[PDB]
Amino acid sequence: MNTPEHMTAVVQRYVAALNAGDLDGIVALFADDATVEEPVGSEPRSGTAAIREFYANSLKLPLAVELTQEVRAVANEAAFAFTVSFEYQGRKTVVAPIDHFRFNGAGKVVSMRALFGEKNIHA
């Protein structure tokens, strides 16, 4: 089974890559068969190609990202609270999602779902 230590590291690495703008770094964290659903309720993006393009499009504005609380991790799953902030054509927007990773036996993210609505989008 996955250690919480590793899962927590991977979450820090995810946030590190977003702050650094490191697309290879982000996609590395995922398994090539993996899925991303951001926000929850949207068409989950599937495969390396789709996940790669999702984060490339996200990283068209430079992002300020930070964990706002300890990572939760157990039984092949982590979840975490954080902010994602960006500024464009006037104003700054702070989104506050809760994300959720499921990890495979190899310790790569096989699914990530980002849960947040309009009410969690502050601008």
Which positions lie near a copy of itself, rule CB under 8 A?
Answer: 4, 8, 39-42, 68-81, 96-98, 100, 115-120
Residue 86: helix, strand or coil by DSSP?
Answer: strand
Residue type, 83: T
Report, in Å, the least distance between residue 80 CB and a copy of itself: 7
Residue type, 17: A
CB nearer to a copy of itself: pick between 27 and 37: 37
Report, in Å, the least distance between residue 72 CB and a copy of itself: 5
Report, in Å, the least distance between residue 21 CB and a copy of itself: 25
CB nearer to a copy of itself: pick between 69 and 89: 69
Report, in Å, the least distance between residue 4 CB and a copy of itself: 5
CB nearer to a copy of itself: pick between 31 and 115: 115
Q: Name 122's bridge partners.
A: 94
109: which residues sit within 8 A by CB, 6+ positions away? 10, 29, 30, 31, 34, 101, 102, 103
DSSP H helices in 1-123? 4-20, 23-28, 48-58
